[PDB]
Design a protein around this nucleic acid. Structure first.
Ligand SMILES: [Mg+2]
Ligand SMILES: [Mg+2]
Ligand SMILES: [Mg+2]
Ligand SMILES: [Mg+2]
Ligand SMILES: [Mg+2]
Ligand SMILES: [Mg+2]
Ligand SMILES: [Mg+2]
Ligand SMILES: [Mg+2]
Ligand SMILES: [Zn+2]
Lengths: 100, 62, 141, 142, 185, 144, 75
RNA sequence: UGGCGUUCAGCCACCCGAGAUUGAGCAAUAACAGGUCUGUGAUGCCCUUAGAUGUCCGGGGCUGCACGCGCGCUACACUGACUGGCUCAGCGUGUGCCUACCCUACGCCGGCAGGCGCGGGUAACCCGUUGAACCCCAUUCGUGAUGGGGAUCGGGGAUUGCAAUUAUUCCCCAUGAACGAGGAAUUCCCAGUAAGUGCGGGUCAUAAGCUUGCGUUGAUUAAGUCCCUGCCCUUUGUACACACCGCC
């Protein structure tokens, strides 16, 4: 009855739509749940040149990639969750599941 | 040549080749008749007090 | 109510030095005279007993924070090297001048390394480390 | 059974100085240690302008405990002056009259606005092709 | 203690402004006094918001120059602080009167410019910014490669400007600034 | 007692070298070629002498001792990691090289490296660059 | 430019002027006395450490870079 | 809210309030004979193709030096170097496809570079609460290149690697050299800005005097002009239209 289900993704709104889906169906099926706990987002940084050659004024591009992470803890049995982690999953989203 | 004081009553413009000086109509506080047009460096606001080493010559209004 | 924290912690080591001098059971090592204390300092210590001061500074970093100060004693007693090319990085302290010290302060009974590493202190030595502070406090106004 | 816990924060650059105000004696301590052995000893009276502007009777009945996080050596002084000022006004707000608060607010404001208004200034980024945020590199011709 | 304001054991009053021209553009009095000569700044975003900064703060902000001093104000307060002690025990007066005298005796009244040049007069704010930059530079050159602290340089330069003993780059550059614009005025 | 006693010289003829008589003794020895700032404070430490004295308050029968220490810095327990002559090539002993030997052994070692026609040392005969630097711009201190 | 040959220790009489006139100056600092007496700045600190406990100089401040000694008591 | 203005678009001043110009990204029609075939298994034609201009293994060079220019570093010292003590940061990365190369606490051996054993961490979970630097308080200190300054060129110890000679990097040999605030000319820059000042990443077995980002100490002057070097519209003049680097 100690099960943590991690939702990590790039798409903020669709990840929000899955974390609120996976909470509203738990709450509408009467099992106690914690809150949608928001962890801080990580970023990536890549700074390259915007030139194949070495000619031109020296100008640089830049590139980023944000990533988010949420985790949800429950107090439930460990069989109906295969159905719960299946109702309206969304592309992009990488769901981890830990029962231990 | 005594040393006098004067009082700004009107700013006029920014004169010079670079636009580095002002042009201000000042009166005199001793004789309320005298009033000349001069040019002054630095930041100047209206309604303030200046000082003149000479008080005879006069600017060229343009 | 008096402790170490109301004493302007600069001459607390100028009387704890003279107390570990007067009692004098510290096991000064053999090689005291001929060391640089760092890889960034340039001279030897000007003071002729440079070992008791560093034992009092260590005994108060240890009173203040932590049971895990071993290489964090070298992280707190480094400085500024001068390479002749660019300002150098905060260089580490010296490993031996503090490993020898904490083994020399284990000779009397004020330190006790137990778990999660490092050396922590005892309430019995805390008695001594706390009574001369009210002494300096009332004697300095 | 009084639970008069007044938790006030304050910021300079990255100086999250949190004051605190209980009821009891009149004393002030920061990170436990008192106001004397605080940092630069050239900056002593910057903890007394909250006292000396108002007076030492205004701090009768309020005891103070102060948390500090972040910042440099000066911002941890300008955040622990504004903090305990906003904690004095917020104690006269919540536990005694709102009317004798206005004289204390007026006297602190008629000296310096920093006592109550944080500084909306921080450092600024570094654009590509310069050794700083505005200064460009040495351009040479011919 | 209604509002006594040590500047590190000094007093704000007993300050007397002689000239009428520098009356409000020099603020060293009641409202414009603080136990210390330090503030958070924000006095250059508007144009004439600088004329409310106390002259003590503007001396502090204009003392540090030349590279190895950009970012040391907490340090350069201490020089002023020993400087008023030395002036109090060498002249025996109020040194904030001495300093207001040195500003008056050190401010220029005219300057030459390019229209071969022609001469005009100066603004009071110009005269403050000039007298400060002048005597502070003259204290620094006399403390450069000399066994004398910068406090004892500023003490004697403020003395020979409230005295006019021709021992001052502050007064000495006033005649060269006036006589050039006098030949050609 | 801030006045000059007797015996107070101003030039101490020491080791065919004229030593000033006004500097601190920790900076009076450095006139010897080879011994600098660090090794001097040690010699002025292994004998229990004050180093806050001038060159001339120290007696003439007492600077025969600091001198004997600097000549023989072994029997008075100086370690093997101070000596600027460690593991000599010719004999293989550890010692210190003072004002004469530091130029002597140095110009006999460069003659040794020179005789064998060796590229490390066949560059002082040319007067040019070796410790592994490039040149292209960095001399030009005359040179025709 | 001139060269400066100062004194390390007093010969005989510049001390005989220092114990006659220094205690009658209003500004007794080592960079003022050394301009008067032609002495090095490492000696004036030892002379005002003597007159501290000799009790004739009225120490004021003690910052490591500059000390301030006034006249004595009025009378 | 007042002030100014055809009572139009708007400007200045003021109150009230956390703010009454924050900082970058993206970007037009039309065009240049700008640069790149040394990024490509995107590519046309030309030369070579087995004694190979394809491919691999041993060496050595691209780092040489009478001079000349351009980008940067430490400096020329008392607001200052040297010993103690004291107390405060914010962005980040981190055990791999072929892949052997992680950040590392904590116990000891040694001057120090490090070593030997031991544990954690795929990461707000450990390294780490990332006791970061001048600045802060007590210590020694030149008018001569002084303890300022620390370079071409000289004796010894450890690490990466199949290998360091032309010295791969760091402590322990020294010469302790030029440099006393810089000529005509010229770059950058207006508020957390110039400058000072240390950290992270990138490149990477070995690795920062470059660069890309972060923080901390924090100013002087200005709210203006067309004189200089340039741009934008209207009018004007023309023997130029590969267009003033013109034509004659
Ligand atoms: Mg150096
Ligand atoms: Mg550090
Ligand atoms: Mg100066
Ligand atoms: Mg084309
Ligand atoms: Mg091709
Ligand atoms: Mg050049
Ligand atoms: Mg030099
Ligand atoms: Mg220009
Ligand atoms: Zn390609």
């Amino acid at each position: 009855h100690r099960i943590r289900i991690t939702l990590t993704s790039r798409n903020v709104k669709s990840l929000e739509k899955v974390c609120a889906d996976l909470i509203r169906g738990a709450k509408e099926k009467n099992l106690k749940v914690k809150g949608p706990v928001r962890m801080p987002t990580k970023t990536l940084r890549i700074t390259t040149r915007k030139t194949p050659c070495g000619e031109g004024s020296k100008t640089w591009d830049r590139f980023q990639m944000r990533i988010h992470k949420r985790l949800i803890d429950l107090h439930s049995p460990s069989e109906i969750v295969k159905q719960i982690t299946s109702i309206s999953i969304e592309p992009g989203v990488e769901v981890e599941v830990t029962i231990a | 040549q005594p040393i006098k004081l004067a009082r700004v009553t009107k700013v006029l413009g920014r004169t010079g080749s670079q636009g580095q000086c002002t042009q201000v109509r000042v009166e005199f506080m001793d004789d309320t008749s005298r009033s000349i047009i001069r040019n002054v460096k630095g930041p100047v606001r209206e309604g303030d007090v200046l000082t003149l080493l000479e008080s005879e010559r006069e600017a060229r209004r343009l | 109510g008096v402790t170490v924290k109301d004493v302007n912690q600069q001459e607390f080591v100028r009387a704890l030095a003279a107390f570990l001098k007067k009692s004098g059971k510290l096991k000064v090592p053999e090689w005291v005279d001929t060391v640089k204390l760092a890889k960034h300092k340039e001279l030897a210590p000007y003071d002729e007993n440079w070992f008791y001061t560093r034992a009092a500074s260590t005994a108060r970093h240890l009173y203040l924070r932590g049971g895990a100060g071993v290489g964090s004693m070298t992280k707190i007693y480094g400085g500024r090297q001068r390479n002749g090319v660019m300002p150098s990085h905060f260089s580490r302290g010296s490993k031996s001048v503090a490993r020898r010290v904490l083994q020399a302060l284990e000779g009397l009974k004020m330190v006790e390394k137990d778990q999660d590493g490092g050396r922590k202190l005892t309430p019995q030595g805390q008695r001594d480390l706390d009574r001369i502070a009210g002494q300096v406090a009332a004697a300095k106004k | 059974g009084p639970l008069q816990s007044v938790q006030v924060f304050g910021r300079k650059k990255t100086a999250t100085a949190v004051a605190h105000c209980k009821r009891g004696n009149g004393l002030i301590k920061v990170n436990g240690r008192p106001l004397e052995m605080i940092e630069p000893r050239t900056l002593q009276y910057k903890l007394l302008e909250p006292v000396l502007l108002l007076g030492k009777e205004r701090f009768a009945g309020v005891d103070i405990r102060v948390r500090v996080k972040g910042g440099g050596h000066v911002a941890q002084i300008y955040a622990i002056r504004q903090s305990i000022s906003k904690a004095l006004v917020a104690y006269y707000q919540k536990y005694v009259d709102e009317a004798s608060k206005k004289e204390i607010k007026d006297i602190l404001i008629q000296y310096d606005r920093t006592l109550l208004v944080a500084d909306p200034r921080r450092c600024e980024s570094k654009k590509f092709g310069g050794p700083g945020a505005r200064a460009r590199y040495q351009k040479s011709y011919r | 203690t209604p509002d006594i304001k040590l500047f590190g054991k000094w007093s704000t009053d007993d300050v007397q402004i002689n000239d009428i021209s520098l009356q409000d553009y020099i603020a060293v009095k009641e409202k414009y006094a603080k136990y210390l000569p330090h503030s958070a700044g924000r006095y250059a975003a508007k144009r004439f918001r600088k004329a409310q900064c106390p002259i003590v703060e503007r001396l502090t902000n204009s003392m540090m120059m030349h590279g190895r001093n950009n970012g040391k104000k907490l340090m350069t307060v201490r020089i002023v602080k020993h400087a008023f002690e030395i002036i109090h025990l060498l002249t025996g007066e109020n040194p904030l009167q001495v300093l207001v005298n040195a500003i008056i005796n050190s401010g220029p009244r005219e300057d030459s410019t390019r229209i071969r040049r022609q001469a005009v007069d100066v603004s009071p704010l110009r005269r403050v910014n000039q007298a400060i930059w002048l005597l502070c530079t003259g204290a620094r050159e006399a403390a450069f490669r000399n066994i004398k602290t910068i406090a004892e340089c500023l003490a004697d330069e403020l003395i020979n400007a409230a005295k006019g003993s021709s021992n001052s780059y502050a007064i000495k550059k006033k005649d060269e600034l006036e006589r050039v614009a006098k030949s050609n005025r | 007692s801030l006045v000059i006693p007797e015996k107070f010289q101003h030039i101490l003829r020491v080791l065919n070298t004229n030593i000033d008589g006004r500097r601190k003794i920790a900076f009076a020895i450095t006139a010897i070629k080879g011994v600098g700032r660090r090794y001097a404070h040690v010699v002025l430490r292994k004998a229990d002498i004050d180093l806050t004295k001038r060159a001339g308050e120290l007696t003439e029968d007492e600077v025969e001792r600091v001198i004997t220490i600097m000549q023989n810095p072994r029997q008075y327990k100086i370690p093997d990691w101070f000596l600027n002559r460690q593991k000599d090539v010719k004999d293989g002993k550890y010692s210190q090289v003072l004002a004469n030997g530091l130029d002597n052994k140095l110009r006999e070692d460069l003659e040794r490296l020179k005789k064998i026609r060796a590229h490390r040392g066949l560059r002082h005969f040319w007067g040019l660059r070796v410790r592994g630097q490039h040149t292209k711009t960095t001399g030009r201190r005359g040179r025709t | 430019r001139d060269k400066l040959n100062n004194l390390v220790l007093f010969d005989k009489a510049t001390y005989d002027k220092l114990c006659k006139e220094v205690p009658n100056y209003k500004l007794i600092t080592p960079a003022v006395v050394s301009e008067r007496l032609k002495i090095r700045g490492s000696l004036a600190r030892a002379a005002l450490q003597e007159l501290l406990s000799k009790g004739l100089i009225k120490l004021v401040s003690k910052h490591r870079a500059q000390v301030i000694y006034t006249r004595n008591t009025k009378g």
